[PDB]
Design a protein around this ligand. Sequence first.
Ligand code: ICS
Ligand code: ICS
Ligand SMILES: [Cl-]
Ligand SMILES: [Cl-]
Ligand SMILES: [Fe+2]
Ligand SMILES: [Fe+2]
Lengths: 522, 522, 477, 477
Amino acid sequence: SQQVDKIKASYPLFLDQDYKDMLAKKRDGFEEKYPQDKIDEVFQWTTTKEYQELNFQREALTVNPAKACQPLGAVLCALGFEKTMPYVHGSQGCVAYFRSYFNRHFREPVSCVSDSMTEDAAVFGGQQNMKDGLQNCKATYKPDMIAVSTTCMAEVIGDDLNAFINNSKKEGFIPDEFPVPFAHTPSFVGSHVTGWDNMFEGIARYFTLKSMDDKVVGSNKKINIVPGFETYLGNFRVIKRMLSEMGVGYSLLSDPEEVLDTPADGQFRMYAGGTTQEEMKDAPNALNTVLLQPWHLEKTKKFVEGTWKHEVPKLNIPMGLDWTDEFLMKVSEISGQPIPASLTKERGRLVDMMTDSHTWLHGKRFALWGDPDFVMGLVKFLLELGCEPVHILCHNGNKRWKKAVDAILAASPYGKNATVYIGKDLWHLRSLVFTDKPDFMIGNSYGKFIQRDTLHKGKEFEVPLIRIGFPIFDRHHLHRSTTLGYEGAMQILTTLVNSILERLDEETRGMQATDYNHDLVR
Amino acid sequence: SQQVDKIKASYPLFLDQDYKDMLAKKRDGFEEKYPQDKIDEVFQWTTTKEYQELNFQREALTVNPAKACQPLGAVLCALGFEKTMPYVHGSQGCVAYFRSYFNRHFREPVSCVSDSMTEDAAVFGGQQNMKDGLQNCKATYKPDMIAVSTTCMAEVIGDDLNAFINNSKKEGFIPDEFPVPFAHTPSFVGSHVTGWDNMFEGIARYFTLKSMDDKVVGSNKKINIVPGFETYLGNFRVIKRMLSEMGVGYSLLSDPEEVLDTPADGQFRMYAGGTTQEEMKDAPNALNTVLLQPWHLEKTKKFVEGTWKHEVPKLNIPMGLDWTDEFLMKVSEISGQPIPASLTKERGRLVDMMTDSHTWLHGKRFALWGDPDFVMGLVKFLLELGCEPVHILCHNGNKRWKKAVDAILAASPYGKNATVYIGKDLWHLRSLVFTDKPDFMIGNSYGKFIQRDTLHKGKEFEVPLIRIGFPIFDRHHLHRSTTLGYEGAMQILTTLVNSILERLDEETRGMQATDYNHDLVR
Amino acid sequence: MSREEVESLIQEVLEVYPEKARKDRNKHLAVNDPAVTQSKKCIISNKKSQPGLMTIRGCAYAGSKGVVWGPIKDMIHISHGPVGCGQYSRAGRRNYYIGTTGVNAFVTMNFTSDFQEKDIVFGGDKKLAKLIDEVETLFPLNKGISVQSECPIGLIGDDIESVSKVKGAELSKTIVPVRCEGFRGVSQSLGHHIANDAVRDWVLGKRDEDTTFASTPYDVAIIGDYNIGGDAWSSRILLEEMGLRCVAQWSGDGSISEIELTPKVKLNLVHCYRSMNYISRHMEEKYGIPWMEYNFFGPTKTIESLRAIAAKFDESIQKKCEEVIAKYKPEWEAVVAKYRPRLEGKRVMLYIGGLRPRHVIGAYEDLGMEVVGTGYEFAHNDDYDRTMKEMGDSTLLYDDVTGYEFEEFVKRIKPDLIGSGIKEKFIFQKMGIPFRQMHSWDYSGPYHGFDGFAIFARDMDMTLNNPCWKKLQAPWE
Amino acid sequence: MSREEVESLIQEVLEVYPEKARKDRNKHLAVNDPAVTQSKKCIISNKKSQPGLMTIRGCAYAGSKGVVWGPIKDMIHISHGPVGCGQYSRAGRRNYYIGTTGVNAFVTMNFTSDFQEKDIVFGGDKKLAKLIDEVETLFPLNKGISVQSECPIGLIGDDIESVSKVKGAELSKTIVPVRCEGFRGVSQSLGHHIANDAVRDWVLGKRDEDTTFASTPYDVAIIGDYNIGGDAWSSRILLEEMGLRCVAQWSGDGSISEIELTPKVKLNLVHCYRSMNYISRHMEEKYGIPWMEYNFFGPTKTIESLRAIAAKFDESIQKKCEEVIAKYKPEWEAVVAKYRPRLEGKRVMLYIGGLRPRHVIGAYEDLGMEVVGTGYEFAHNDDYDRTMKEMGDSTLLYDDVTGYEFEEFVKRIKPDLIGSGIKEKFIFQKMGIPFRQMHSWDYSGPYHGFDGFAIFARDMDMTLNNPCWKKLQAPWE
Ligand code: ICS
Ligand code: ICS
Ligand SMILES: [Cl-]
Ligand SMILES: [Cl-]
Ligand SMILES: [Fe+2]
Ligand SMILES: [Fe+2]
């Protein structure tokens, strides 16, 4: 039933007695459900060290991964170029998923096409799909560039993208000089971040490989900036802001911040902003190229060093205090521009905040996950804050990356109780937060189910989730945030300390029980 | 007892059994405490309509006010001037409190002096305190300006600030040319916002009343901006940012954003930034003067209109969509500058966020409080979001203001269930959130005690606090936020919708009970 | 708009395309004539999508794993292949259930074999067998396993049937191989069929020789309700207040046992015809169980459906039917009285999957609204036959609409509201057109039944009439 | 620094002042000589503050309402006068208590008469009487009312004593008029004295003729512990483990009844000498109850205090004393073992109110730290007499330090840590000096007793050794 004045959606409608009774009858009559005592027994067992040991012996099963597949990253990379349509050669179901996954994170349109290969293409390959698909896409959506990646069907069948695109041009389906950069993006190698690297390197090659003879390193007086797979608008923005404040000439290569944040003013804009073709063509004339997320830009780095002859600096992601300092000092060295008073002051304001909030942060224990560079930057900043990053999970991390993070942990006493895990998933992480309970998780929306599980054991075992990463689907507009630079560090510090204080308020809200410590001032 | 590797502070130390037993013994032995059944009975009664009626009949008692006293606002106004020392003539106890109150909100030093009048000054007045006070302050702290207000002792004794300062100069305690603007700031009239108005008008008079002969309206091609009592750094910053982006010449009169946000770089800076004496002297040459918070700038307005001959526009605080639009259109008209593409796009991004988040905001019911302009802007934006601001409390509001808010409520169907309360305090508000329970409170840290009270009735009756206002003492760095302009609206929207979604996640976190609705995607 | 104006709109839009695409798309766009009974005279459907045109369609894995199998709560569904498909589809669809997740129920979890290069090169069957043992160790209360094939499985020649037979025998466990690779078919639709056949072949016959279930004359199953936001629960309640016993829900909040018990029912009640007509036909053929289509969207359809269902039973059920209708009358009348004046005359365009584009029209009409365009991602002509009588004369129909077409149609038609999916939502909001998600219910619902109509009405009103829509134009122009 | 260096530091700092201020401030600054026992040869204290110099002091209302009366949990304290004073002091001081706030306990609430112009012009006594009736209606479980006078009350000639007598008789309620207006005295100090006298005159004698209390030889009261962060509770526990019975706490977590029962005890244990020596003297004079000073900061002082207290009782208490000391030995030893190597040799400057600037020195020394400067806001010479033997030779002492002085002293001395209040904290942090709040415990504590020492050690370490302090200097400057 409903009362028209106070309509109930699913929560709390199904708590009404008649729905409760109905659901009990369904269960008892037809579900042949395990008895509640057995459910409780099994739940309890899943929280144990014995279960954790079996869990960590998995070799074949993955449960609740913390990574996605290559073409997702190729699509994001492609979106960052002016008037560019991402185009995934292969199966259309993939494109529905890539679009939806980003739609839910950004709360924005996400434009991407498929060439709709079907089973029939197993005989002959996807060449005709590429010919019609490129012609159709260009005519219909009027991109200035089509950036091509692949789904796993196309990779298994072995379609030669280069040849298929060349033949499309030879036979007149798209103009000879129309830009169609490409990359093979197999979902069974690496992860979404690998797809980004592959896509970027393909676009870089397309615009520069054949034209190197007139290029002179440093001649355009700029620094190229490659952001990698990045899903916070504030991160593209803060980098451009800092460089502009310093008077540093730069080119941000793959810049989706406009197309992922168009105004609602009565028109839909399929394309907005983005890195220009002129910027990509001129990129080898930069002084150098800086990689913001080097641990997933390894192919790009080899191309930039091998072909552009840029001496790519060994810089970590600009996250936290030390690594933002290092990024700015290196940019100063390369560009000849001093670090300006504005940035020096901003740095000092972050340090002020650290001094103001250190007592509540000190010794706090975190479980955390995400992509390799984000994770290592979060670890570094947590150590700078006097926090203990005890469970560090990077499903898509590698052995060399893990050695680097273990070395960072070694340089700080706050690293003493920390372990780095690669190849492990959120079902592994779930065990760790039961058996070696931290204060908080820092992770994406999939962490909510871990928080749920921990509360079920009891309130005293609950590990609250702090949402930083990708995807974040259950809160609104967090994609506008910043994690890089001093601004990002200020945002992260603020979120962390207030999460601590929110939880403390919850724990001290009990009248005449715990509210002796429900302080007005903290 | 303590275990050295997991030391317990008060929470949870005093929950150890030995402390619990000790506290039970103290109670039973010596406290002659009302029985718990009687405590429960009385608590329950305090949540009732019958109690509410008695509560609203109060004429003499105030409980948990939502206002402070005049000189607090005079001090904040004074801080906004270059190398200016706030100086409160009267009793030193007041200055310790004003400094600490602001220290706890900004987490920054707050410099202010007293002239330490004592009981002896009742015979003879505080003239000698002013003479030595001004000489001492100038010598020791080397301000370029001393801005004088009063404590209630000085007001009751009737000290004539003007005469005392003139005699201080006559007798050589400070130079004749040294600026010593003043204002009478009685704590028993109005509130802290009135102190701000009084202080500002006194400073404006000091620099302009006697030099009007050479002034020509519009000759400096600028607009003066008077911010009023403002405790979000983001609000000073956003107004300057928007005006700069529009290419509008402006003078922000009282600008404490630098002095309330100095870097931690190894030195203490007693003064930083601020409105210059030159800006105050030249202010009558502006095109016009815009008051950001007109409902506490009435004395300032009469001076600006009557003496500077500026045609102060009828503008609401620039909060929410409509009132930011109106502010920018009026600034465009006065300055001749068009509204730039950057601001048009920012507006559209706010509107996009509104479209993205409207389904979770719709119909949500709020109790809220604060100062009059902040409250009316919050009400307006809530209506724009399709929310219902059902309990609107402004302790320091007046009848004319209430009429204005009631008219805003009338202009929207979302105002149908709303009442505006003036002269009422947070003990009155406590009753309202029991008897006509909203979804959330939007208020300052004193609201935490109301949330505590509501939870004690039961979890289903709990009204969570969303912290927006002043003072905020129990979270860190919220004073960096923004509430004005499109940026402020975007911030408020984000905070509101995610507060809603956080609570919904809490209510749906129960395994096999309510987690059917614990959605990954919202 | 007139028939001629809509025909002109179609031709104008089709001008952008190269000739092959133009000729194809013309066949998938039509102006409704409710007098037509054979939609194969009017529109083509269930064909391949044209390359590069930004179809909104998914794949057969979405139709099998996402739609049919995934909701079954006490089984573990393996997304078998590389990591993407299971991750993008993890908890995207609001197929609600009651259970203890990770313990006795598994719906919102993502189990995968996370194929790497070695699995592609040498096959994943050994990995699958090991994975099954690991599932059994770590999730001992699972009541069956399904293997949801992703694109590479058939391409590389793996034999998941053999693995499922051998392991299922070894463990005395139902393990269901599902060949729903996304290269099969043209859309989600073939996934439904594949999934139905897998239920038939590996689950449905388990109790064929078991005589222990005590049947009654009033036993029914809800077939093709995936309980989006609780939709099946707000349907079930009405059926049971009418005196019926709902033995099974396929597959929202569904359990493996209630699927196995379904051959014991007297009548199959089909909501989603497109996804479940296959197994409904099978159950008629094999067990003699009749099936009938119904519609629980809005009071008019829900009342008609209750009466038509009750007519299949005796006078006692027909009496209870009228009692149910009498009970809810004042409730839905109060909803109409509040919301119809807020919505009267407003025009809606829909685009959804295979059922809702026609099924929700009555509910709109119960609020005085007009559905001026509708269409489906993956419907067949039997769906279109059911649509043309439900839509007005000279309204626009679109099959596998392209992004371009949908935008251009909307620009001309200027509907007051659009009901479609997540990939569409943000486009149309930016155009200043109120949008409601008509797959996920925009995180609201249920929409089925009387209780669902109240929420549907609230939702259409909150969005169509929201103050935000008057604010897209800056007042300076 | 040598004595001569400290002396020339004082002289250098005072050069900024005009002559009158310079001559005054010289008298309030001294170089310690622990050989001195008459501090009136060495330093002046408890004088007016010089105008315009940014004293850190508060007023007599802070010392009465904020400090002594405010903590009493089952009474309602009225901030009588305009709105400011009660608002700034609402829940600023962490005087912890157990109660149901708004129902039986009222500590963190702000009750005020909110004086307006008419109240100033015509007086507030009629408003006060009405306010009392309103309190009784809305807060019926209050066990007494105090009236904490703000500046205007005495200035305008109101008679709160008459109102309190008349209303107290009418209501059979203890209503206590407190003339703690901030114009009185020079600091918080006179507020303590006024407050003590008001307890004496209006509360303490209630039970003088009542012989029903079941007294024992082991009954004590904790006098002058305001339970900051639970400090009194972590003291009480030890006293009672030693076999004593703590009849009362003045006034942290204090109730009106336990105050009224205090004249029945055998011994008054005085922690805060400055604030409650007055009432302790009165109780010895009137009731014959002895009093003794003690110190529960750090293990050395806590052990000495427990022994000295036990020595006032019999062999059974002395035996329990040694049992207590043995119990906690391994606990504080573990704290020392962990934190002393982290803190050894580090130098601290303190500036606090009336007790802590000497009382915490032993606890710092228990961690190997050296207090190189200390001083008080509002101490008297009897406090300085107790300080000079606790501080090292040639250390710096400052009475009512000005902001300028404190900064300049710190710049020269370069302490490793500063312990002071909220108005000081952020200044010194920006200078790169670790800072701990030694009034509020920086929202931590307790610090009293054995359990408090663990938290104190943790806190000094977390702050002094924090990684943030290495980061103030940008690497390009
Ligand atoms: S199953 Fe089908 S696309 Fe019938 S694949 Fe799709 S939960 Fe749609 S129009 Mo999403 S044939 Fe169900 C559907 Fe309809 S996922 Fe849901 S809303 S009634
Ligand atoms: S009462 Fe005094 S200023 Fe003895 S007014 Fe002050 S809670 Fe200080 S050094 Mo705040 S004489 Fe207590 C004090 Fe000491 S408020 Fe606390 S810390 S031991
Ligand atoms: Cl889950
Ligand atoms: Cl309170
Ligand atoms: Fe959006
Ligand atoms: Fe600060």
